[PDB]
Amino acid sequence: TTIVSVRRNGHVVIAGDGQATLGNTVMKGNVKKVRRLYNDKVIAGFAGGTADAFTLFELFERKLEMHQGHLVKAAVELAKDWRTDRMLRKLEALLAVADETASLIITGNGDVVQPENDLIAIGSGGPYAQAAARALLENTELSAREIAEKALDIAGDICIYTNHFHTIEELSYK
Amino acid sequence: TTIVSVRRNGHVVIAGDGQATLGNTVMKGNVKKVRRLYNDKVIAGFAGGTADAFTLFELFERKLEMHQGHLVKAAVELAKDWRTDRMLRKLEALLAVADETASLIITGNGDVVQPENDLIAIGSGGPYAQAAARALLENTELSAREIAEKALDIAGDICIYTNHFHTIEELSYK
Ligand SMILES: [Mg+2]
Ligand SMILES: [Mg+2]
């Protein structure tokens, strides 16, 4: 698994691989790990059970409505319920989300994190994509979509658990 | 991870590294491991899950309000709940805290400890910073902020799990 997010020049994106491993065997290659939320104003991705993320994403929209779409406050309420509830505590996933305001991470420990320069990379391949995106962002003018695309192909070549099927959700705020 | 506390000449401080390791890989370098509490009257640090410490720090403020800000009595009530509750028993972290009165440590076993000369050092690098702070305190006139800063840079050079990003919260009571 690998997922990436990048923000540049008024554009922010999220991208993720389609591989679903089972043991040493590939279960499914076309999984959609990236999607839009809250009237498409938000883009997000997940590493974990497809239902485990679908549940957390729905409650996150309810946290946004209570906070009128604020990204940070809705996330802390989601991470707060995640470690707290005995039902949600069984859930095991890594959530990534960004909007025009900022990108940040969420975890089943209840930790929330905004990466330096809003650069998110998660999944088993995420350290590899982070090293690739870090290089292009400093040494090239490429748009945030161009960097997240190339960084994910590299993590898929390296991580055995990541493949080259891609899904992306870009957001332009300029 | 490394965290340090020092008290001298009416000044007490807490300092900690930003490294967040995952396996053999660095996850985040800028983590804020030190913060203030109870109307900024108290400074504290933590080694463990960022949510696991944020939960314990909140309840400790509630223990302070019940005890009117007493540091020692509020800590024993926190360490008492920590080992006791089945929910808190799952939490795994090392807490450090000090005010103008004294510095002391807290643990998930429920142990509370005041170091000799209120010198706290914890984390994977904490034994290294303790040996450095012990030398400067006896052989130099340096202020408590100067010793905690230099002791943490040494532990970061030594401990692979500690880095040189720093956060400090000083308290002056003179
Ligand atoms: Mg592969
Ligand atoms: Mg180091």
From Swiss-Prot, chains A, B:
It is an enzyme of class 3 (hydrolase). Transmembrane segments: none annotated. It catalyses: ATP-dependent cleavage of peptide bonds with broad specificity. CDD domains: protease_HslV (cd01913). The active site is at residue 1. SUPFAM superfamilies: N-terminal nucleophile aminohydrolases (Ntn hydrolases). Its main location: cytoplasm. Allosterically activated by HslU binding. GO terms for biological process: proteolysis involved in protein catabolic process. Signal peptide: none annotated. Coiled coil: none annotated. Induction: By heat shock. Its EC number is 3.4.25.2. GO terms for cellular component: HslUV protease complex; proteasome core complex. InterPro entries: ATP-dep_Prtase_HsIV_su (IPR022281), Ntn_hydrolases_N (IPR029055), Proteasome_sua/b (IPR001353), Proteasome_suB-type (IPR023333). Disulfide bonds: none annotated. One of its GO terms (molecular function) is metal ion binding. It is found in: Cytoplasm. Na(+) binds at residues 156, 159, 162. Keywords: Allosteric enzyme, Cytoplasm, Hydrolase, Metal-binding, Protease, Sodium, Stress response, Threonine protease. It holds the Pfam family Proteasome. Protease subunit of a proteasome-like degradation complex believed to be a general protein degrading machinery. A double ring-shaped homohexamer of HslV is capped on each side by a ring-shaped HslU homohexamer. The assembly of the HslU/HslV complex is dependent on binding of ATP. HAMAP family: HslV (MF_00248). Belongs to the peptidase T1B family. HslV subfamily. This is ATP-dependent protease subunit HslV. The lineage of its organism: Bacteria, Pseudomonadati, Pseudomonadota, Gammaproteobacteria, Enterobacterales.
